[PDB]
Design an enzyme around this catalytic site. Sequence first.
Site, PDB file in Angstrom:
ATOM      1  N   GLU B  56       0.724  -1.238   0.121  1.00  0.00           N
ATOM      2  CA  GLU B  56       0.043  -0.046   0.058  1.00  0.00           C
ATOM      3  C   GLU B  56       0.910   1.403  -0.023  1.00  0.00           C
ATOM      4  N   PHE B 118     -12.953  -6.341  13.383  1.00  0.00           N
ATOM      5  CA  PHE B 118     -11.860  -6.849  12.676  1.00  0.00           C
ATOM      6  C   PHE B 118     -11.390  -5.831  11.516  1.00  0.00           C
ATOM      7  N   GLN B 119     -10.124  -5.744  11.036  1.00  0.00           N
ATOM      8  CA  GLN B 119      -9.726  -4.839  10.389  1.00  0.00           C
ATOM      9  C   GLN B 119      -9.998  -3.333  10.750  1.00  0.00           C
ATOM     10  N   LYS B 168     -18.330   0.285   4.706  1.00  0.00           N
ATOM     11  CA  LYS B 168     -18.831  -0.907   3.959  1.00  0.00           C
ATOM     12  C   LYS B 168     -20.365  -0.801   3.571  1.00  0.00           C
ATOM     13  N   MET B 499      24.565   8.920   4.161  1.00  0.00           N
ATOM     14  CA  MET B 499      24.243  10.234   4.661  1.00  0.00           C
ATOM     15  C   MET B 499      24.251  10.077   6.323  1.00  0.00           C
TER      16      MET B 499
HETATM   17  C1  LIG Z   1      18.880  14.540   3.362  1.00  0.00           C
HETATM   18  C2  LIG Z   1      18.122  16.028   2.842  1.00  0.00           C
HETATM   19  C3  LIG Z   1      18.872  17.247   2.735  1.00  0.00           C
HETATM   20  C4  LIG Z   1      18.466  18.207   2.278  1.00  0.00           C
HETATM   21  N1  LIG Z   1      18.982  19.587   2.096  1.00  0.00           N
HETATM   22  C5  LIG Z   1      18.684  20.504   1.737  1.00  0.00           C
HETATM   23  C6  LIG Z   1      19.427  21.870   0.986  1.00  0.00           C
HETATM   24  O1  LIG Z   1      20.549  21.722   1.603  1.00  0.00           O
HETATM   25  N2  LIG Z   1      18.871  22.775   0.653  1.00  0.00           N
HETATM   26  C7  LIG Z   1      17.515  22.710   0.027  1.00  0.00           C
HETATM   27  O2  LIG Z   1      17.224  23.895  -0.467  1.00  0.00           O
HETATM   28  N3  LIG Z   1      16.705  21.733   0.382  1.00  0.00           N
HETATM   29  C8  LIG Z   1      17.384  20.657   0.987  1.00  0.00           C
HETATM   30  N4  LIG Z   1      16.507  19.603   1.150  1.00  0.00           N
HETATM   31  C9  LIG Z   1      15.027  19.610   1.325  1.00  0.00           C
HETATM   32  C10 LIG Z   1      14.374  20.403   2.579  1.00  0.00           C
HETATM   33  O3  LIG Z   1      14.292  19.534   3.624  1.00  0.00           O
HETATM   34  C11 LIG Z   1      12.987  21.015   2.276  1.00  0.00           C
HETATM   35  O4  LIG Z   1      12.423  20.108   1.766  1.00  0.00           O
HETATM   36  C12 LIG Z   1      13.094  21.976   0.939  1.00  0.00           C
HETATM   37  O5  LIG Z   1      13.599  23.244   1.878  1.00  0.00           O
HETATM   38  C13 LIG Z   1      11.788  22.241   0.475  1.00  0.00           C
HETATM   39  O6  LIG Z   1      11.933  23.299  -0.406  1.00  0.00           O
HETATM   40  P1  LIG Z   1      10.870  24.505  -0.463  1.00  0.00           P
HETATM   41  O7  LIG Z   1      10.757  24.891   0.922  1.00  0.00           O
HETATM   42  O8  LIG Z   1      11.082  25.505  -1.274  1.00  0.00           O
HETATM   43  O9  LIG Z   1       9.570  23.816  -0.885  1.00  0.00           O
HETATM   44  P2  LIG Z   1       8.074  23.465  -0.057  1.00  0.00           P
HETATM   45  O10 LIG Z   1       8.541  22.632   1.030  1.00  0.00           O
HETATM   46  O11 LIG Z   1       7.268  22.487  -1.122  1.00  0.00           O
HETATM   47  O12 LIG Z   1       7.453  24.647   0.228  1.00  0.00           O
HETATM   48  C14 LIG Z   1       6.586  25.280  -0.483  1.00  0.00           C
HETATM   49  C15 LIG Z   1       5.892  26.759   0.086  1.00  0.00           C
HETATM   50  O13 LIG Z   1       5.613  27.612  -0.975  1.00  0.00           O
HETATM   51  C16 LIG Z   1       4.286  28.004  -0.655  1.00  0.00           C
HETATM   52  N5  LIG Z   1       3.421  27.723  -1.946  1.00  0.00           N
HETATM   53  C17 LIG Z   1       3.061  26.529  -2.399  1.00  0.00           C
HETATM   54  N6  LIG Z   1       2.432  26.449  -3.352  1.00  0.00           N
HETATM   55  C18 LIG Z   1       2.137  27.881  -3.839  1.00  0.00           C
HETATM   56  C19 LIG Z   1       1.690  28.662  -4.920  1.00  0.00           C
HETATM   57  N7  LIG Z   1       0.899  27.958  -5.695  1.00  0.00           N
HETATM   58  N8  LIG Z   1       1.788  29.901  -4.615  1.00  0.00           N
HETATM   59  C20 LIG Z   1       2.481  30.504  -3.876  1.00  0.00           C
HETATM   60  N9  LIG Z   1       2.913  29.756  -2.708  1.00  0.00           N
HETATM   61  C21 LIG Z   1       3.009  28.581  -2.792  1.00  0.00           C
HETATM   62  C22 LIG Z   1       3.863  26.854   0.328  1.00  0.00           C
HETATM   63  O14 LIG Z   1       2.792  27.577   1.159  1.00  0.00           O
HETATM   64  C23 LIG Z   1       5.152  26.527   1.180  1.00  0.00           C
HETATM   65  O15 LIG Z   1       5.068  27.370   2.178  1.00  0.00           O
HETATM   66  C24 LIG Z   1      16.948  18.366   1.962  1.00  0.00           C
HETATM   67  C25 LIG Z   1      16.446  17.111   2.038  1.00  0.00           C
HETATM   68  C26 LIG Z   1      16.744  15.926   2.513  1.00  0.00           C
HETATM   69  C27 LIG Z   1      16.067  14.390   2.546  1.00  0.00           C
HETATM   70  C1  LIG Z   2      -8.685 -13.524   7.566  1.00  0.00           C
HETATM   71  C2  LIG Z   2      -9.078 -13.670   9.150  1.00  0.00           C
HETATM   72  C3  LIG Z   2     -10.194 -14.611   9.560  1.00  0.00           C
HETATM   73  C4  LIG Z   2     -10.289 -14.881  10.888  1.00  0.00           C
HETATM   74  N1  LIG Z   2     -11.308 -15.616  11.299  1.00  0.00           N
HETATM   75  C5  LIG Z   2     -11.376 -16.008  12.716  1.00  0.00           C
HETATM   76  C6  LIG Z   2     -12.262 -17.116  13.131  1.00  0.00           C
HETATM   77  O1  LIG Z   2     -12.920 -17.746  12.144  1.00  0.00           O
HETATM   78  N2  LIG Z   2     -12.256 -17.476  14.462  1.00  0.00           N
HETATM   79  C7  LIG Z   2     -11.437 -17.233  15.219  1.00  0.00           C
HETATM   80  O2  LIG Z   2     -11.588 -17.404  16.560  1.00  0.00           O
HETATM   81  N3  LIG Z   2     -10.570 -15.979  14.897  1.00  0.00           N
HETATM   82  C8  LIG Z   2     -10.510 -15.540  13.590  1.00  0.00           C
HETATM   83  N4  LIG Z   2      -9.828 -14.626  13.215  1.00  0.00           N
HETATM   84  C9  LIG Z   2      -9.060 -13.593  14.228  1.00  0.00           C
HETATM   85  C10 LIG Z   2      -9.930 -12.631  14.749  1.00  0.00           C
HETATM   86  O3  LIG Z   2      -9.910 -11.380  13.709  1.00  0.00           O
HETATM   87  C11 LIG Z   2      -9.468 -12.166  16.316  1.00  0.00           C
HETATM   88  O4  LIG Z   2      -8.208 -11.598  16.255  1.00  0.00           O
HETATM   89  C12 LIG Z   2      -9.742 -13.318  17.074  1.00  0.00           C
HETATM   90  O5  LIG Z   2     -11.015 -13.587  17.450  1.00  0.00           O
HETATM   91  C13 LIG Z   2      -9.092 -13.151  18.230  1.00  0.00           C
HETATM   92  O6  LIG Z   2      -9.473 -13.377  19.476  1.00  0.00           O
HETATM   93  P1  LIG Z   2      -9.102 -13.452  20.844  1.00  0.00           P
HETATM   94  O7  LIG Z   2     -10.014 -13.126  22.042  1.00  0.00           O
HETATM   95  O8  LIG Z   2      -8.572 -14.896  21.067  1.00  0.00           O
HETATM   96  O9  LIG Z   2      -7.662 -12.587  20.912  1.00  0.00           O
HETATM   97  P2  LIG Z   2      -7.665 -11.273  21.383  1.00  0.00           P
HETATM   98  O10 LIG Z   2      -8.170 -10.222  20.381  1.00  0.00           O
HETATM   99  O11 LIG Z   2      -6.200 -10.724  21.815  1.00  0.00           O
HETATM  100  O12 LIG Z   2      -8.634 -11.101  22.718  1.00  0.00           O
HETATM  101  C14 LIG Z   2      -8.106 -10.425  23.863  1.00  0.00           C
HETATM  102  C15 LIG Z   2      -8.813 -10.345  25.150  1.00  0.00           C
HETATM  103  O13 LIG Z   2      -8.102 -11.411  26.004  1.00  0.00           O
HETATM  104  C16 LIG Z   2      -8.132 -10.979  27.440  1.00  0.00           C
HETATM  105  N5  LIG Z   2      -7.040 -11.157  27.978  1.00  0.00           N
HETATM  106  C17 LIG Z   2      -5.721 -10.815  27.620  1.00  0.00           C
HETATM  107  N6  LIG Z   2      -5.055 -11.262  28.629  1.00  0.00           N
HETATM  108  C18 LIG Z   2      -5.666 -11.692  29.842  1.00  0.00           C
HETATM  109  C19 LIG Z   2      -5.376 -12.045  31.097  1.00  0.00           C
HETATM  110  N7  LIG Z   2      -4.171 -12.290  31.425  1.00  0.00           N
HETATM  111  N8  LIG Z   2      -6.606 -12.410  31.869  1.00  0.00           N
HETATM  112  C20 LIG Z   2      -7.867 -12.359  31.282  1.00  0.00           C
HETATM  113  N9  LIG Z   2      -8.052 -12.005  30.149  1.00  0.00           N
HETATM  114  C21 LIG Z   2      -6.905 -11.782  29.269  1.00  0.00           C
HETATM  115  C22 LIG Z   2      -8.368  -9.313  26.917  1.00  0.00           C
HETATM  116  O14 LIG Z   2      -8.953  -8.474  28.196  1.00  0.00           O
HETATM  117  C23 LIG Z   2      -9.235  -9.265  25.995  1.00  0.00           C
HETATM  118  O15 LIG Z   2     -10.472  -9.210  26.304  1.00  0.00           O
HETATM  119  C24 LIG Z   2      -9.476 -14.017  11.694  1.00  0.00           C
HETATM  120  C25 LIG Z   2      -8.497 -13.472  11.395  1.00  0.00           C
HETATM  121  C26 LIG Z   2      -8.116 -13.258  10.119  1.00  0.00           C
HETATM  122  C27 LIG Z   2      -7.258 -12.199   9.716  1.00  0.00           C
END
Ligand SMILES: Cc1cc2nc3c(=O)[nH]c(=O)nc-3n(C[C@H](O)[C@H](O)[C@H](O)COP(=O)(O)OP(=O)(O)OC[C@H]3O[C@@H](n4cnc5c(N)ncnc54)[C@H](O)[C@@H]3O)c2cc1C
Ligand SMILES: Cc1cc2nc3c(=O)[nH]c(=O)nc-3n(C[C@H](O)[C@H](O)[C@H](O)COP(=O)(O)OP(=O)(O)OC[C@H]3O[C@@H](n4cnc5c(N)ncnc54)[C@H](O)[C@@H]3O)c2cc1C
Lengths: 602, 604, 50, 224, 237, 35
Positions: B56, B118-119, B168, B499
């Site tokens: 992602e 879940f999730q 959902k 770096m």
């Molecule tokens: C390892 C590392 C080293 C770095 N060292 C340097 C360095 O030495 N020198 C350097 O320059 N950079 C360096 N950078 C990048 C630095 O960290 C900043 O990201 C950099 O300053 C960003 O450039 P900027 O501020 O000009 O643009 P931006 O961070 O994107 O800022 C844009 C600004 O312009 C404004 N603005 C945006 N759009 C418009 C618009 N349409 N009209 C008017 N205003 C607008 C915004 O409000 C904002 O305040 C480094 C990056 C890394 C990862």
């Molecule tokens: C694709 C997928 C499918 C799934 N399908 C299933 C399924 O079909 N069946 C299934 O069972 N699971 C399934 N799961 C997992 C599910 O999402 C839950 O995470 C699962 O049910 C975990 O349950 P749990 O209560 O055992 O664990 P936990 O979520 O960790 O339960 C925590 C509970 O344990 C208690 N607890 C912890 N320590 C103590 C302690 N010392 N004393 C007393 N209580 C304590 C806590 O207070 C809490 O209430 C699936 C997961 C995925 C990713």
Amino acid sequence: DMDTSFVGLTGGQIFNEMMSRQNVDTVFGYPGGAILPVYDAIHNSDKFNFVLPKHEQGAGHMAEGYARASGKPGVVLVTSGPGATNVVTPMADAFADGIPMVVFTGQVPTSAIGTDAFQEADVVGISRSCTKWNVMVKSVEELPLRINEAFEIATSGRPGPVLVDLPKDVTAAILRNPIPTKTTLPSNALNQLTSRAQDEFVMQSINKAADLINLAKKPVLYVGAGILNHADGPRLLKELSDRAQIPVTTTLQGLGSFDQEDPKSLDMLGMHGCATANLAVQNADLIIAVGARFDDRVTGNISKFAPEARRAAAEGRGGIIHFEVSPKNINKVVQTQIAVEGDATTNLGKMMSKIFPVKERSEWFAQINKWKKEYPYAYMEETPGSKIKPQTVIKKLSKVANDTGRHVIVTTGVGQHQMWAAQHWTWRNPHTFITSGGLGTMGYGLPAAIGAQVAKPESLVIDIDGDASFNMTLTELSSAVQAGTPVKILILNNEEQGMVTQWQSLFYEHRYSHTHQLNPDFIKLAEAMGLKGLRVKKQEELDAKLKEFVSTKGPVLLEVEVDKKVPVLPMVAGGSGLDEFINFDPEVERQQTELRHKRTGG
Amino acid sequence: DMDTSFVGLTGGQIFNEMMSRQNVDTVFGYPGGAILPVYDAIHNSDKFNFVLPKHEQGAGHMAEGYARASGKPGVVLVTSGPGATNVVTPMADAFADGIPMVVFTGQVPTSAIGTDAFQEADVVGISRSCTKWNVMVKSVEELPLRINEAFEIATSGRPGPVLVDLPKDVTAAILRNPIPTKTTLPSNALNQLTSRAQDEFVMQSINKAADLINLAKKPVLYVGAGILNHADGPRLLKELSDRAQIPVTTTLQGLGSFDQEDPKSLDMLGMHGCATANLAVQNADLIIAVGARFDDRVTGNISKFAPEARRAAAEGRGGIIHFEVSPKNINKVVQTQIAVEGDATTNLGKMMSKIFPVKERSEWFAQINKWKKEYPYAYMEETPGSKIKPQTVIKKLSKVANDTGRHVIVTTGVGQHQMWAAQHWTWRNPHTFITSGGLGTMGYGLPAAIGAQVAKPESLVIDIDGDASFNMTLTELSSAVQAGTPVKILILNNEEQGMVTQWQSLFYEHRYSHTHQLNPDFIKLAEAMGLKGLRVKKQEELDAKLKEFVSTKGPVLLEVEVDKKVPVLPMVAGGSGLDEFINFDPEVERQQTELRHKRTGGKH
Amino acid sequence: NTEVKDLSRMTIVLQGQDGVIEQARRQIEDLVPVYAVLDYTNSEIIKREL
Amino acid sequence: IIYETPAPSRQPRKQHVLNCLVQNEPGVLSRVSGTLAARGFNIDSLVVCNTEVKDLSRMTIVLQGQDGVIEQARRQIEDLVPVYAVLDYTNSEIIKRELVMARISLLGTEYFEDLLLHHHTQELVAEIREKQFHPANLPASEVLRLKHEHLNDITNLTNNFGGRVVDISETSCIVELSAKPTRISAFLKLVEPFGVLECARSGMMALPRTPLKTSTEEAADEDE
Amino acid sequence: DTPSWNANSAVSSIIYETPAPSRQPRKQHVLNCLVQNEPGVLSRVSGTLAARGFNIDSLVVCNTEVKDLSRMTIVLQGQDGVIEQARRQIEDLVPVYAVLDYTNSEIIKRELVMARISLLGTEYFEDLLLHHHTSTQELVAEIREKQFHPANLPASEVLRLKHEHLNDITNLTNNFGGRVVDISETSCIVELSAKPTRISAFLKLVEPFGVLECARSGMMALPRTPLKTSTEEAADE
Amino acid sequence: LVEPFGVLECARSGMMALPRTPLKTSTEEAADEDE
Ligand SMILES: Cc1cc2nc3c(=O)[nH]c(=O)nc-3n(C[C@H](O)[C@H](O)[C@H](O)COP(=O)(O)OP(=O)(O)OC[C@H]3O[C@@H](n4cnc5c(N)ncnc54)[C@H](O)[C@@H]3O)c2cc1C
Ligand SMILES: Cc1cc2nc3c(=O)[nH]c(=O)nc-3n(C[C@H](O)[C@H](O)[C@H](O)COP(=O)(O)OP(=O)(O)OC[C@H]3O[C@@H](n4cnc5c(N)ncnc54)[C@H](O)[C@@H]3O)c2cc1C
Ligand SMILES: Nc1ncnc2c1ncn2[C@@H]1O[C@H](COP(=O)(O)OP(=O)(O)OP(=O)(O)O)[C@@H](O)[C@H]1O
Ligand SMILES: Nc1ncnc2c1ncn2[C@@H]1O[C@H](COP(=O)(O)OP(=O)(O)OP(=O)(O)O)[C@@H](O)[C@H]1O
Ligand SMILES: COC(=O)c1ccccc1CS(=O)(=O)NC(=O)Nc1nc(OC)cc(OC)n1
Ligand SMILES: COC(=O)c1ccccc1CS(=O)(=O)NC(=O)Nc1nc(OC)cc(OC)n1
Ligand SMILES: Cc1ncc(C[n+]2csc(CCOP(=O)(O)OP(=O)(O)O)c2C)c(N)n1
Ligand SMILES: Cc1ncc(C[n+]2csc(CCOP(=O)(O)OP(=O)(O)O)c2C)c(N)n1
Ligand SMILES: [Mg+2]
Ligand SMILES: [Mg+2]
Ligand SMILES: [Mg+2]
Ligand SMILES: [Mg+2]
């Protein structure tokens, strides 16, 4: 009371000492600009080990596996900016499944905070909703205190992730004055004054809990991952199933807490749990919840969940007993009849011996064993003239890895392979199953498998991952050969997103919208990562490759080409109850196969 | 007010139609459970070209690259939970650099929200700090409105990321009621109706700004990325540079906005900028800030930033002029005497009439030429017996890129290689340099290259990555092949986190702690991913294999082993101002070469 | 803000059934920086507003 | 006079007041507070006030710092999309009010020292209960009068500050007061010796006076 | 030097002072009968309630300045099914127009109390209460030996205590919205009208001074009107 | 009630509370009929 053993040391030097004071022997993380003063102090440290990945997301997942395997908090030490935001997902995973870990993220100097500084991010605000607690260390005086607070919260009650921001100017500054060392938790102030009130509450409720137990005609031990948060957890679990003769069902995260070789086991329930367990829960009159939170993946449908238990509740015959450590999870999904607040293990130990031992429940166990006979994990077993079926691969590997005479730890990703690895595999010994359920993160298989072997180097770790999930963190292959972790990686490659395609076939008329990704050549990928790669195309080659991988010294990769579009069964989805499951049928599986081709053409 | 077009359509079907009504032709994303009703509607759509990454985070970065190249917002469509927590880094990146993108994340049904489902994750509460604005669509009735609100904010003022959380039950339910598709933004839309007190107010600042430019004796044009957010941007910048004959310096994100082979070009200023631009700023009496935010990496020591310009302001002879579209960035780091709020390009065009024409500047314009000779971009050049080095690699790559005749778009990772690719490449065309400056995310190069290639298929997209930046978002090579993008992946392999090793060699006594990851084989990696991978190891093998890497038709990888622990110079760190820099010295590096071998024990 | 160092008091008003609101109480009280969340419903209190 | 007259101290500080007009969308409260906390502003109070208008809220932020620093905060909040505008009331005649409700014991200092030490969880306990005007070793009649004597003294304070006693028990008396924060703290300091059991300060609500101060200088200013 | 609350000790005092549920889930039921003023209407409304075992707390017949029309504010306890039953019983009586239910309405409850309160302190009241008790023993010397008893004080005192007590009682009465209508040489009479629970609070606070006589009567009721703003009136659906 | 005059500008707080103890006479609390 204040300490004075950190006078003269910089913030980074203090951090190094705090690791030894908190019994940390392994620290994951990735260096950076704002976290430099910390890394300068832990340079060649003699306090702990350092597993260095190549993506901060990996280090977070490595800490989860390290925690689930051993039982110690996983430590993550990354930098600010993007280095911290890449640890959000594993913290969300640890927040759902309840994994103990302390994440130390770097930060811009305090004089630059709030100026849109270089690599500045509101990590405290971002990680607020996915952590039990977080804090930004303002001064070097607070650093020894905030660390102790973080580790305590991460281990107290239900284990969970905590984040501690470490600004550069704070870790670079030198402590020149005594500091308070012991934590100041407001939860302790309440529990101290209200100790006897809570102590009497849990004991008087235990007595009532033991009363309805003796009234149960068809009880079911509904266990979660809560029993795994104690050493004598599963030990007291089996001794209750032995005493009162109670059948035991478990959740995905609780798997391993009960050896299903025991005749009383129902193993996993839920959406993809066996029909034996789902029906046992539905026909139960008294459900004893041991460390579970009643997830929607478990209950199926709240409206019709455990109807007989709800009947016995209104009749005073049974009901639901809930052993819970955190009162927030009581009556938030389903309403219980008896609430026992505290550690499930220690609570059962006090409820024990107040229960009447049972000789045998003839009628109840009979229908249960009859349910195994008519409703097992039924699937389309492979024929000699067909492609390898994925389900049997787990069942094959289950005995192969176990007969090596080693301690086996299984780690999976998220998908159909995740479910199949939990269904067929026999789970002897606790803390042997490490997966993501609460959040369900893909790419969780490999990094957690690596970190789990760091905690248990002698033990045999095996990663049953899927191709789509493995594609998210296949980057962390060369980290396993750098940390010296001989991990065993299995890839049930179906060349598709099975878990999604399954839903798209049942609810979306076989319309597979962007669920087929282009998988790379895994065997050459492993070789590129300096890792032993193996594949298997035909069926007869599998029995030789499985024994070759589990006996391979060092990191090894295993790719198994499995069948296409294989739905995980039985399935409880939609507005259906756990008793209203979709059972397997080779004829309706044939129709679904032929009609799929007609709607596709390829 | 109302609209009767989405009557009978589901939340998914509406989303499919809303994308075409917002002029979107490219969507990056990864499917999931809570986003199924949306993906079912975009199945085989004739409106946009969907791109499927392996992670992602890739989808988000590809959206950034698509926005930096084309200009149109980058749409991200992922699922709930983990799928939403992975696009956090791309959002925070686009929120720091100001990149227009709209992130659609799935969500559990509204009934399940707040039950630790879940999730499920508080995506709104998480992305609240790293997005311009987020919102959760509570009903199908709001869906056509929330999308319009998202795309407007993401492109209004300074462009940025917005989050749209989609449950959902919302994306699956059927809309059966006429609904509004446009509502006024309470912050800017209806507030700007008081235009007379703003349009005529800024006009007073415009006139006072032009008078100060004509009064300036040593004016420096401070240009940022803000001038690139307009079509006639770079043109009016060049016109001003010819009207008042003032020199132009740009930031890291301002590169490409002005011709660098022009005598009025001061190249890049800042921390690792040239000494010419830095000394020009410190000795200027007037600084025209156009589209820049005075970053810490640019100004260096704020207490030492432009002492001559501050002195001119006290004497009423000069000062600092700032062109910002966001008033929040005005007087935040430096005190501005006269600010011109609004679009920089728009304000520059309405100021030309008030600016006196200049023929030629003598004294000060000849002094900066002395700085170009005395303090140019210098480094340890190659010698027979020594291995390759990054400075000369980018130098030659810039020459073989112009030899093609194509349109060259360059993306980079984050580290030492980023700086060298920024200064030693000759930038002349806008929207050609795409790098992560504000947040500085590693692994940004490869996916940003892919997204940029989708925007411009007939353009030479080159990715100048490091060994640490690459091999972080490593899996996206399988996406470049799947999407069919002829990207050019270059790796400056110094087998280190360069770096960071530089900061450890300068400020931590060559004490490298976990600063060396274990790199895989990049040419066997490419083969596995499905694209040919080249590699240059010898010095004389560089030029002859540098044309093959560019002339290759399709995705190609090139690993070029370079020298190690080579510091990026010049450098402005610590409490040092822009005039207190540290330039290149062959004798110092010779000592640092022996000192490093001594302290490390010959390990590096 | 009470007249006690590092101690604040928050007054919240909710709507819904007792089962939903009690859960909200247990959800807030479980937080780290809070001491205890009291339920003032069904209790004699002096409600004030400005 | 020379000896008593007030004096400043090292590192001065002044108060700034902002007034935010925001749209009542889901969130908001977490947005403004988060934006101000993610930038390390001072923030003495927030106080979300409800206008009697549909979907329109109002916030009163109290700040301290240099005039250019708090101006950054103003532009930082106004940029947020649900915020109509942020007005600066620090340089205008306004009415700042704060609500405070205290319980306040009637049993005096001696009992208050006993009550605090009791909840603080020796020899000093005995000495406190051996003091002359503790409820112990003191007739029930004098305790009764000392209760009402304190009750009157508290009542007179609340009256002078324009407050009121809303509740009277057998051991305490809940008081109410709405005034300036500089006056609220003054009242809380004066009634402090009586022993404050519970307390709750709302924050600060601001509403500008309708522009009017002088009659003869309205047109006879001649400043132009 | 005045001590201050601790961050922890403050929380402990709050939850300790926070009272337990000291009230039943049931509430104070109020019924307002509209009766015709016929000879003997009072005796039959009471008789109907008394003969059916209803826990009534008050009755109070009120005139309404309308010819041959009166109203009674009946207050009782019990379930909703019991009160409604009690309501229908009364309404069935032919001199009764209707019996309104105010148990769930915004009303204004009013009791009227008149009490004579002693100014001679608690000692004298304790003596007086013991003297009148002996009808139909060494404590009489134990009470008259206590400090702040009139007989153990100079003539200048007690006079100074009587007015001090008078000031306290007056301040109590004023705060509750009452008034002192009579000031005797040794006592005073107060007059207060408010909520029945507010009267009970007043008669508890003024109790230690000594209540010589008392007359509480019963509660009257008149419906208020719940006025809400135009943005809260538009909160439909 | 003030609305008809015309409210030009309004600022209305949330809601804060302080627990009260309902006083009852010694005769009323003596009614401990918990038989
Ligand atoms: C390892 C590392 C080293 C770095 N060292 C340097 C360095 O030495 N020198 C350097 O320059 N950079 C360096 N950078 C990048 C630095 O960290 C900043 O990201 C950099 O300053 C960003 O450039 P900027 O501020 O000009 O643009 P931006 O961070 O994107 O800022 C844009 C600004 O312009 C404004 N603005 C945006 N759009 C418009 C618009 N349409 N009209 C008017 N205003 C607008 C915004 O409000 C904002 O305040 C480094 C990056 C890394 C990862
Ligand atoms: C694709 C997928 C499918 C799934 N399908 C299933 C399924 O079909 N069946 C299934 O069972 N699971 C399934 N799961 C997992 C599910 O999402 C839950 O995470 C699962 O049910 C975990 O349950 P749990 O209560 O055992 O664990 P936990 O979520 O960790 O339960 C925590 C509970 O344990 C208690 N607890 C912890 N320590 C103590 C302690 N010392 N004393 C007393 N209580 C304590 C806590 O207070 C809490 O209430 C699936 C997961 C995925 C990713
Ligand atoms: N201990 C007490 N119990 C009941 N009432 C009291 C007590 N002490 C004082 N009172 C009276 O209560 C009055 C408070 O009047 P107030 O305006 O607060 O009524 P209210 O806002 O409707 O609150 P409530 O609903 O509790 O009556 C005091 O002025 C005082 O006359
Ligand atoms: N001991 C007293 N003798 C006479 N008047 C007194 C005494 N004490 C107080 N008063 C005054 O009498 C006032 C009460 O008079 P009130 O308002 O009740 O007129 P009233 O109803 O006509 O009574 P009355 O019929 O006795 O004259 C008190 O407020 C008080 O000012
Ligand atoms: C990460 O920088 C900071 O935390 C920071 C941010 C804003 C303002 C000041 C600082 C501290 S710093 O200027 O001294 N930089 C620093 O500590 N590390 C540092 N490491 C680099 O290489 C990894 C590159 C690099 O920016 C080019 N900065
Ligand atoms: C994604 O589900 C939810 O967001 C959710 C959460 C809580 C309650 C209800 C839902 C919706 S759902 O139960 O009906 N699940 C769904 O729509 N899709 C669905 N797809 C899967 O494969 C990708 C796997 C899977 O869980 C095993 N759920
Ligand atoms: C980060 C993330 N993205 C998307 C999803 C939704 N999702 C769940 S399973 C799945 C497909 C995974 O298939 P795979 O990993 O190959 O398992 P397999 O099909 O082999 O059984 C997807 C996309 C998710 N849970 N997490
Ligand atoms: C995700 C992330 N992690 C860490 C950092 C800090 N960081 C910046 S550059 C760098 C080393 C990368 O060097 P490299 O990518 O190999 O380019 P090089 O310096 O060698 O030229 C690191 C760790 C970052 N900017 N982003
Ligand atoms: Mg798959
Ligand atoms: Mg490198
Ligand atoms: Mg005044
Ligand atoms: Mg009242």
